[PDB]
Amino acid sequence: NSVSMIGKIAETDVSGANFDGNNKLSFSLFFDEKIDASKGVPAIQILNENNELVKTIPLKDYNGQKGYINFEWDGTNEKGEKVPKGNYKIKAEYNLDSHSKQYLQTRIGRGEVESVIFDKGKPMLRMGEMVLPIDSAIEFYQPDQK
Amino acid sequence: NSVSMIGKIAETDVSGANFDGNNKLSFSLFFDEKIDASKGVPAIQILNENNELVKTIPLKDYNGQKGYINFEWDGTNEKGEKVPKGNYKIKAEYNLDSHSKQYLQTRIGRGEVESVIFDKGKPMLRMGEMVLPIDSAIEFYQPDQK
Amino acid sequence: NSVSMIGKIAETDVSGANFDGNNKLSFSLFFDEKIDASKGVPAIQILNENNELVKTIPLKDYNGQKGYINFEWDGTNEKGEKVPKGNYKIKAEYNLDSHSKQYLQTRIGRGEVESVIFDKGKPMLRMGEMVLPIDSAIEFYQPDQK
Amino acid sequence: NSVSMIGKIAETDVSGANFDGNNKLSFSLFFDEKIDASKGVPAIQILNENNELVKTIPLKDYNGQKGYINFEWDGTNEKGEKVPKGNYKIKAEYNLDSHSKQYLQTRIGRGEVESVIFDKGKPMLRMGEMVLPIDSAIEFYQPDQK
Known part of the structure; x- marks a missing residue:
């Protein structure tokens, strides 16, 4: 969601x-x-x-x-x-x-999350060329910080 | 939520x-x-x-x-x-x-999500004249991209 | 959440x-x-x-x-x-x-959501003087629109 | 999530x-x-x-x-x-x-939430030097308000 x-x-x-x-x-x-x-x-x-x-x-x-x-x-x-x-x-x-x-x-x-995709029911993060499941993400923060 | x-x-x-x-x-x-x-x-x-x-x-x-x-x-x-x-x-x-x-x-x-509506307990997306359930959405991204 | x-x-x-x-x-x-x-x-x-x-x-x-x-x-x-x-x-x-x-x-x-409060475990919306449970909300949109 | x-x-x-x-x-x-x-x-x-x-x-x-x-x-x-x-x-x-x-x-x-971290499966808030579980948070609002 x-x-x-x-x-x-x-x-x-x-x-x-x-x-x-x-x-x-x-x-x-x-x-x-x-x-x-x-x-x-x-x-x-x-x-x-x-x-x-x-x-x-x-x-x-x-x-x-x-x-x-x-x-x-x-x-x-x-x-x-x-x-x-x-x-x-x-x-x-x-x-x-x-x-x-x-x-x-x-x-x-790592990198900017450019879009969010729903593959079948499951959510997924587009990060440039890479498309990963949401569960793989271990931290989030805004650009130009950390 | x-x-x-x-x-x-x-x-x-x-x-x-x-x-x-x-x-x-x-x-x-x-x-x-x-x-x-x-x-x-x-x-x-x-x-x-x-x-x-x-x-x-x-x-x-x-x-x-x-x-x-x-x-x-x-x-x-x-x-x-x-x-x-x-x-x-x-x-x-x-x-x-x-x-x-x-x-x-x-x-x-497809298009910009202008508001979010709750029908009974359940959520829904206003996208111009169309009002769709959240489960129908297959991808999200910010404007001027993709 | x-x-x-x-x-x-x-x-x-x-x-x-x-x-x-x-x-x-x-x-x-x-x-x-x-x-x-x-x-x-x-x-x-x-x-x-x-x-x-x-x-x-x-x-x-x-x-x-x-x-x-x-x-x-x-x-x-x-x-x-x-x-x-x-x-x-x-x-x-x-x-x-x-x-x-x-x-x-x-x-x-109705009005701008100024803060979100967790009363005991449950979430709640501050809307000026009024403080309502999240489940009472039936629609959301950005200011100066609708 | x-x-x-x-x-x-x-x-x-x-x-x-x-x-x-x-x-x-x-x-x-x-x-x-x-x-x-x-x-x-x-x-x-x-x-x-x-x-x-x-x-x-x-x-x-x-x-x-x-x-x-x-x-x-x-x-x-x-x-x-x-x-x-x-x-x-x-x-x-x-x-x-x-x-x-x-x-x-x-x-x-209290303070600005600078990042969100996932310990194992579970979420956590970075607030300067402090890193707290999400469940510890009792209220949220935008800066320069309240």
Whole structure:
């Protein structure tokens, strides 16, 4: 019955993406603030089931963008070799703060709730490309905060 | 208990209208953006239970309007002959996009939720002239999006 | 669980007030628009259980006000004589529209929802002076509309 | 399912804080309007389980601030002596109104709802540093009102 979330930022229990072993993997990250390439080196970190860094994708070419941005991953590691199938965490660091010496942060499975969908009887959140059940959401707050 | 949907755009499972066989049929269509007659030929298409085009109503005279607009249909086809009673789909195309070569779209049974009504204990959505049960709604989002 | 109504206009199934037979009766009416004394003769009509006009209270002295306004009724009719105890409907007409020749309207038991209260476990709506259970509400919409 | 309360001011059944008997006690108070040191003497009152004033913390140094402010209490009384462990109420008075001769008021366990969190399946309100279950909330309203 509640669609009050629409427009709020949502955080979910989905932090990872399944890689089938072969085919490339499209995914969406939400950037609360505008990407500034001059402030640090912004990038995406792709991590395996044991927190091992497997691929790093630089974000510098997306300077000046904000909000949902789509990306692909060929499924290869840093050397260029295909990785084992499985679940992989996808996080990002951007906009090094001059004062605090800290990067702003984001990851797969959080972002602005753009619409609410009822699939059969059940409710579902559209968060860019991702469409998740309501029960997966673990926190809500307004933009430009937290 | 939730009226959070007031002000949101709603999409419902109601896509059609029953024509009794004789009396004219009033109906409401919601226009998200302002009708521009210079951009394509805007019109309403009225379709029977087998997707056969039965009547076309030109929208050019409503240039410059937006939001809910009311319309009538005498129940006649393009030749001027009354059609069988039954259920008829009502869609519209407007504002041909110069770049994409695609029309914006709307139909009966979607639009801004203007109020929420409680019939007996049960809740209902006012969407222009139409008043539908909440359970009929299949998606919600904010205006000027999707 | 839902407080989304706060800030919306609410309409309830409470349309009347009990008069005990003797003591005066305080009550609250909500004025969607600013009272204009030059446009018609604005007033409150007090009606008994059989729709009989019992007292009329002129509103002209409240020109220029809007929103919740409090009033009292001594419990007397137009002649000055105390009326039978019981339930009495309280409506008002104000701001005669020059074009439509129609008065704007309001009554006891509708208005802006100013807060939501949880009394013991149960939820409750503050609507000026009146505090009603949520189940009494029969419609919701935003200000300056309907 | 409802997060409509995000952005609203909340009042809860939590009015006190447990002091363990030794370690200092961090806490948050919400200031609806900007602290004006020139208007009265603004301060926090800390009260024991029998409404006995135990410590007073002056607020004058926080002139010009508004919203959630964090504070600590060493757990000592006005003489400088550690107090018995237990539950202690924490209220504040600020901004003496020239006309009414009354202080504005606040206390621990009310304020703006900044986010909504789901612990396991269950919902929770972030109100500055405090995180409370939804069931603890006893009233909601919009800012700058009540």
